[PDB]
Design a protein around this ligand. Structure first.
Ligand SMILES: C=C(C)CCOP(=O)(O)OP(=O)(O)O
Ligand SMILES: [Cl-]
Lengths: 281, 291
């Protein structure tokens, strides 16, 4: 049972390990560690939380790449181009439940409730993202943000919320988490599209991210075009798109620094935000 | 957030609601009812468990159809032809977590543990099935059986396990569950190759190994007639060929014998648990297929 449980687990995890070994930032690791400046979670619990968070993050990327027909991830072919969609779905989903299993080792009665809630949020966000893309209905800036706070902030919320289960630190971290979730997402959007080639391809495909959203709604005919496209569904700043994105990022950065200062400072979190902000300067 | 949650929910669940309308046997409900002879679960808990089980099962079917590249289910388009693979993955996975959420309403400390274990088993079984197919690894009979017990019985095991959490009856039903899991799957394998009526109702217009072909491959290890037949004819012809080869090597007889042993074992194990007329009658009816 040891030798072949281990073979099975290794087989099932192959697509996931492919992605995990690619060069990446582990921002969720770094964020959680920086947040522990406030929360003072014991190392053993923190390690579990970080593992859960990174597991779910990587698994969700496998799924994301299938859901939007991406070709590359972290510079390399997406897992499903190598292993097939079937094995990748299975692998990513297996990791979700291995994440659940690991949450149970936290031995806290609220942990599973929080994990369930955050996974449901994540799927709501993802599901909207997909729906818009499939119907070519470009979200507004505000719709995009709300979706991102579910799809991206869902996991940030899980890490910090699980930490809060093991901490007497009671300050409201939700505003800062919202800022950070938007910041990270929009920064990714910017990093992916700033060098026309990916940008134009996105527009062709109906792949919506912060720069293309700005570009689409910038044209006056946008409203009437988008309204025709939204009738098919259950759907309700004169500057360049990259400049607008850079400006949004600078605002989000400044806001983060304000919110960190409002919580008494956090040099490690500040240094992380500053490093990540080089991307758009 | 009130009127809006409902819209989003409906978007997310559309592929799942489509699949709910498709023909199906609802055996998991029938087996749960049969196990309730012993377990006598309070109706409020039983209703939740059955809903959880059916949700997880239907979600797994959405995923299964993507994972094995099915084109039809019971003669109708697979969900992902209608809604696309991205929406279906998202829908099925959302339902998994809605299932988790509902398991929490059972308010028993062991329910989530059971859920986790059984979902992990399900994924291991599915994952092996996929791996073998993708990597041209023909399993042995013993490996196939072990895979089937995970893939086919993972959710069966969850239903009964969750039931037993709210039952005074605490005897070990796992051996019987294993026998039943194998029996159901191998009977399906058999019926799908040996019975035109059963094939027509279930796998209408469908072209992936199974108990009989595994026996045929490993019993005549030098032959490659199975592989060669599958690589060839429109499916009626391919199937005839496969069927004749299986006939000629004794794979149908071997499968019938395996099923008879599984049947007899089930009756012995049911008797050892104190008897269960409903389950016995169901096994007997299902056993006609191979008599
Ligand atoms: C939801 C989002 C924004 C995914 C991208 O995250 P990362 O930029 O952290 O990707 P890796 O470093 O983990 O590759
Ligand atoms: Cl510190």
């Amino acid at each position: 049972m040891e030798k072949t449980q281990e073979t099975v687990q290794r087989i099932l995890l192959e697509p996931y390990k492919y992605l995990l070994q690619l060069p990446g930032k582990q921002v969720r690791t770094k964020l959680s560690q920086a947040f522990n400046h406030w929360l003072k979670v014991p190392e053993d619990k923190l390690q579990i939380i970080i593992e859960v968070t990174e597991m779910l993050h990587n698994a969700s990327l496998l799924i994301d790449d299938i859901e939007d027909n991406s070709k590359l991830r972290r510079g390399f072919p997406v897992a499903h181009s190598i292993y097939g969609i079937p094995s990748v779905i299975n692998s990513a989903n297996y990791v979700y439940f291995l994440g659940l299993e690991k949450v149970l080792t936290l031995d806290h009665p609220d942990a599973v409730k929080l994990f369930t809630r955050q996974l449901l949020e994540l799927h709501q966000g993802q599901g909207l993202d997909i729906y818009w893309r499939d119907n070519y209905t470009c979200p507004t800036e505000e719709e995009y943000k709300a979706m991102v706070l579910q799809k991206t902030g869902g996991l940030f919320g899980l890490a910090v919320g699980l930490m809060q289960l093991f901490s007497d630190y009671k300050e409201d971290l939700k505003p800062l988490l919202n800022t950070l979730g938007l910041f990270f997402q929009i920064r990714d959007d910017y990093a992916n599209l700033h060098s026309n080639k990916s940008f134009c391809e996105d527009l062709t495909e109906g792949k919506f991210s912060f720069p293309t959203i700005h570009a689409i709604w910038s044209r006056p005919e946008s409203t009437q075009v988008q309204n025709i496209l939204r009738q098919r569904t259950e759907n309700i700043e004169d500057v360049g798109s990259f400049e607008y994105t850079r400006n949004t990022l600078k605002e989000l950065e400044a806001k983060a620094y304000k919110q960190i200062d409002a919580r008494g400072g956090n040099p490690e979190l500040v240094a992380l935000v500053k490093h990540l902000s080089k991307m758009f300067k």
